[PDB]
Amino acid sequence: SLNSTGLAQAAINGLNARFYESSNARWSSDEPWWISGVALTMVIEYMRRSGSKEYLDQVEDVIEVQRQPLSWWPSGEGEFRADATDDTGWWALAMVRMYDLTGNEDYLNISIKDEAYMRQWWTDTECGGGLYVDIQDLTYKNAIANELYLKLVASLANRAPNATIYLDRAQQAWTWFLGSGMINGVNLINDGLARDSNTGSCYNNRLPVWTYNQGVILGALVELYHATKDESYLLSAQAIADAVLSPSNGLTSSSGVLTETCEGSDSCNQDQQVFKGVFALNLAELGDAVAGASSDPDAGQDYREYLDTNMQSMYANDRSEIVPTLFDSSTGDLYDVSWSGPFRNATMPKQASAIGLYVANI
Ligand SMILES: OC[C@H]1O[C@@H](OC[C@H]2O[C@@H](O)[C@H](O)[C@@H](O)[C@@H]2O)[C@H](O)[C@@H](O)[C@@H]1O
Ligand SMILES: OC[C@H]1O[C@@H](O)[C@H](O)[C@@H](O)[C@@H]1O
């Protein structure tokens, strides 16, 4: 009897009431900029899946301000071209969703500029491929920047005029990712690559398995499927999702709730706080793709059931309602980091993650 649209809307209102800065057309300037990008993605997705337009004016306002040349990276010349390739990739994908919502070629063009900017930091001379995250420094090829890039080129393969150059890039980038060793022996993705001191060969650095690194890659494989109709892409995506769902890998609790590795120690930082909702949103994309690619009515049920199970735990154990006043009539819902542990405080990354989960159930 849960309304995921109603709850997503209350979570976005809570996000806006506590964290939106009208003077800055941004959420929480005291929180990383890339998470304003994620929040924009969540709000855009809400509107797409629910058919609402309630936050369109706000979303356009954020885009018009945040696409300006960044005060901390003016050489990027704005259009979300930032000092890290993953920061750029979050906003680029948000503009892909904006394009899907509106049909306005302006947003697609931004996505195209972002792809060309990110590709500047692809090299074949280290690790056989992939891009660096850290543009000034060029020391780390990690999972998330390369998953964002892959999902971006795969998305442009379905939407842009030179579709064939993008689909080549996407197939080459997926081949590189799969061969990098970052997907480990239980089909989960570790944080990035290390480089051998003597030989220059790269290997899985065995840093943690973060939920958003099991999630952006699913959206990328879903887009590769759509560009090629080759179900092998869904089969790979399903193996990664199936490993997240399996309690033996510890991302999923014995009560079946998605759990960041840092929750136990109560050490989830501003970044890690947003990871879960990113995985959720991408898992919903995979489920929709699997259910569509087949005639079996049970197709994608476990993904759908998983998302429901998480929604209901978050709803029940991790929610807090804003206190309306005689002056501020604002109403909505506030969320903490653990989708099962108790509510202690809300932050903007925790809130954006929460919206992602409700939007994945619309
Ligand atoms: O929290 C682990 C995470 O740390 C990453 O840096 C965090 C954060 O950096 C932003 O600038 C970027 O847009 C985010 O996607 C990223 O989470 C580190 O470099 C990652 O490899 C790692 O997963
Ligand atoms: O370098 C990363 C950038 O992150 C953003 O969240 C901040 O607004 C910038 O001041 C900072 O330079």
Automatic annotation (TrEMBL):
GO terms for biological process: carbohydrate metabolic process. It comes from the Eukaryota. Disulfide bonds join C127-C202, C262-C268. This is Uncharacterized protein. It comes from Chaetomium thermophilum (strain DSM 1495 / CBS 144.50 / IMI 039719) (Thermochaetoides thermophila). The chain holds residues 78 to 439 of 439 of the full protein.
